[PDB]
Every structure is written in structure tokens, then in C-alpha cells.
Design an enzyme around this catalytic site. Sequence first.
Site, PDB file in Angstrom:
ATOM      1  N   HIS A 139       0.873  -1.212   0.000  1.00 45.14           N
ATOM      2  CA  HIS A 139       0.000   0.000   0.000  1.00 45.14           C
ATOM      3  C   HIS A 139       0.893   1.240   0.000  1.00 45.14           C
ATOM      4  CE1 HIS A 139      -3.305  -2.577   2.071  1.00 45.14           C
ATOM      5  NE2 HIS A 139      -3.117  -2.944   0.808  1.00 45.14           N
ATOM      6  N   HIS A 193      -9.160  -1.713  -5.074  1.00 49.28           N
ATOM      7  CA  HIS A 193      -8.126  -2.090  -4.076  1.00 49.28           C
ATOM      8  C   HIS A 193      -7.132  -3.070  -4.697  1.00 49.28           C
ATOM      9  CE1 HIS A 193      -5.959  -2.022  -0.395  1.00 49.28           C
ATOM     10  NE2 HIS A 193      -5.808  -3.339  -0.556  1.00 49.28           N
ATOM     11  N   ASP A 218      -3.158  -2.738  -4.980  1.00 47.91           N
ATOM     12  CA  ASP A 218      -2.199  -3.797  -4.600  1.00 47.91           C
ATOM     13  C   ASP A 218      -1.223  -4.074  -5.759  1.00 47.91           C
ATOM     14  OD1 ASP A 218      -2.999  -4.233  -1.937  1.00 47.91           O
ATOM     15  OD2 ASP A 218      -4.469  -5.794  -2.550  1.00 47.91           O
ATOM     16  N   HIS A 253      -0.395 -11.236  -4.893  1.00 44.94           N
ATOM     17  CA  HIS A 253       1.009 -10.884  -4.556  1.00 44.94           C
ATOM     18  C   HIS A 253       1.951 -11.920  -5.158  1.00 44.94           C
ATOM     19  CE1 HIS A 253      -0.879  -8.002  -1.931  1.00 44.94           C
ATOM     20  NE2 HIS A 253      -1.549  -9.039  -1.333  1.00 44.94           N
TER      21      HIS A 253
HETATM   22 ZN   LIG Z   1      -4.011  -4.461  -0.148  1.00 43.51          ZN
END
Ligand SMILES: [Zn+2]
Length: 299
Positions: free
Chosen positions: A78, A237, A241, A264
Site C-alpha cells: 500500500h 483495491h 495492490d 502478490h
Molecule cells: Zn491491499
Amino acid sequence: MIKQRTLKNIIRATGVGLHSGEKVYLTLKPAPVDTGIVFSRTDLDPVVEIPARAENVGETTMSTTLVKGDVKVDTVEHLLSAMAGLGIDNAYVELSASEVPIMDGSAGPFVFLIQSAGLQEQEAAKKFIRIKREVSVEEGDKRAVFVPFDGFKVSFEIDFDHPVFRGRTQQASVDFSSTSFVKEVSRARTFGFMRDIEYLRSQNLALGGSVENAIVVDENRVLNEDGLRYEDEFVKHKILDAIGDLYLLGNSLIGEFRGFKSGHALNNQLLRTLIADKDAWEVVTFEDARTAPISYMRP
Ligand SMILES: [Zn+2]
Ligand SMILES: COC(=O)c1ccc(O)cc1
Ligand SMILES: COC(=O)c1ccc(O)cc1
């Protein structure tokens, strides 16, 4: 030219780790040309620095974790999103503990704290990675791709079978030439499911999680009393990310990213595949900001 940027002034913030629930003091400091973003664990003696680079990503479970041996800096995405969005090349990020503070679960508090301190143009060309050829990684139904694009654009699709997602926008595209990182993406928060919190806490995840730093979804409704900041907050969001994950390349991108249920782990695998595939990219500078395909806010 488009110049490298650092911070004008030191700024400080306090919060708690989303995953650890531990209290943490954050300090952002100016850094010289070509430093990049370097995280520092100031609670350790001696102090341990970890550059914010793809090769230092050690864990990708529900955040991006930088690791040097036994030393971790968790949930960097973030804050790196805010730094990418404001065009910060060079900064020292000091932390009193192993996880960046979650703040309100978005990049909003970080873009405000940085723009408050102010940005400093530095006497060196900002380097960009221009995507020259398609690079894609897949695993199962997940996909992450870079394609050539004269600008910076992110497209993302999520796919949740949950009543709160029924008929909701699960796909978005932001072209940062049309759209403000700050107004459109920075305020989109982290989201979580009540039905998960028992499993997550058992895994030392989301120990600091609450309606104060996340959209909490319960079966048919969002629990947060004041609701959503965006109709498509959830997919916004995931775009936030992705920008954060992709800034571990160490330079701003000239290209398009497309994520399909990418997180991720697969974002980092895309970076490692790009770095290895040297014919698919080049480093470029722009000696005239006015003629370049991407622009940044005045510092
Ligand atoms: Zn996040
Ligand atoms: C009840 O679930 C949570 O509070 C929660 C908070 C943040 C998350 O990322 C996930 C879950
Ligand atoms: C990883 O994100 C970027 O490269 C980036 C470039 C330009 C922006 O406006 C925002 C992000």
C-alpha cells in the site's frame, strides 16, 4: 527532463500492522539519486536495510513481505502504491517493527502524508522500464501480463461467488493519463470476509484487522456502518495492490498490466519473468516532460 523525486522533509506516522497487530512507528526520509525505496528496521541492533526490489520478496501469502534472512518487512504494497502514484524514486522507510502500518487499509493516508511533506525533484533523469514485448505468467485460472503501451495502464478482474459481489463491478481499467491515482485508486481499502477470520488469525494473518482498517463482509452485507467509498472499491483495491507489487521492479513502467485473479505471488512471478526476459524491456529517460507519454503532479 523528467527528474527523479524524493521527499522534501522527513515525515512520521504511527499505526499497527494488519497481519501482526503490532504497534509501529514509520519514518519517511529523503534519499540520494538512484537509491530506490529502501526499508530499514530501526528496532534491530545493528539496523537492517532491505531494498524494495523483486529479488528481496520472501513471502507472498496475503501481502508482499521483504525478507533478509530472519528479518522481515511485511505489507509494503500500500505504501509502495502511494510512492509509485506520486512518482517517488528515492526514499528511506524506517520502521520500529516487522510490518508497515495499515492506517485506514488504503493508500489515502500515505499520499496525504507524502504530499504534506512535499516532493523534491533531484538533478538526475528518472529511469522508466518500457515494455517492448508481451510477457505473461499463468497458474491455474490466475493470469498476469505486461503488454506494450505508450503510457501506464492497469486492468484487473476479480471473481468472487459471494452475494455481496453479485451484479457488482468485478473488473476495472485505469489509464493514469486519463485518471488520478489519488482520486480514483488511493482511497480503495483492504477487504476481508467474516467467514475467514478464524482461519486467518490461526495463520497469524489479519490480527490487527477491523472495520477501522478494512471493508468487513458478512454473508450478504458490508458491516462497516458508513459503507463503501466506491461502487467498485474491491477491484480498485486489487489495482492499488498490483501497482504496489509492481513497483518492486525499482522503476516506473511504460506499459500495460492486466491481472486476472492475480495476487502478490503471481505479481512477483511476473516481475521475475520480466527481469529474466531482457529482450522484452528497455530502460528509457525523457529529456522533455512535455513530450513524454506520462506526467506527474507538480512536486
Ligand atoms: Zn491491499
Ligand atoms: C472479520 O475479518 C476482518 O476483520 C478482516 C480484516 C482484514 C482482512 O484483510 C481480513 C479480515
Ligand atoms: C508500478 O506503477 C507505476 O509504474 C506507475 C507509473 C505511473 C503512475 O502514474 C502510477 C504508477
